[PDB]
Amino acid sequence: MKLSQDSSQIELLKELMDLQKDMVVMLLSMLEGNVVNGTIGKQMVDMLVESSNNVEMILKFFDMFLKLKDLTSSDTFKEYDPDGKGVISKRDFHKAMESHKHYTQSETEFLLSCAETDENETLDYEEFVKRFHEPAKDIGFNVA
Secondary structure (H helix, E strand, C coil): CHHHHCCCCCHHHHHHHHHHHHHHHHHHHHCCCCCCCCHHHHHHHHHHHHCHHHHHHHHHHHHHHHHHHHHHHCHHHHHHCCCCCCEEEHHHHHHHHHHHCCCCHHHHHHHHHHCCCCCCCEEEHHHHCCCCHHHHHHHHHHHC
């Protein structure tokens, strides 16, 4: 959450979320050959309950950045961006989100903060949904 809002700390976020993927992969390997009501499962569940709040935040992050692809693919946003130029405005993206209505006020504010716009207040949603959706789609599948 901290690095996503910042603009310079993008490669660090990529490295951190690659470390996250490798952690989840090791966790999956720890359950390889699992049995019903096993000690390893007991201990993983204990760890998850111990760190439940952090998993809550991680899951919320992944969900809000997984719904971004559906928002982009919706026809309401296609009306706002009639051509495939890949560039949309701040009002335009905000109104698209507010019509999409599946994002709360806090989620919309966080998305706007994580969205970087230049002097024209226009962002590239074709990279905004690749810098975040793809790592989310990659890690969250392993978490699931």
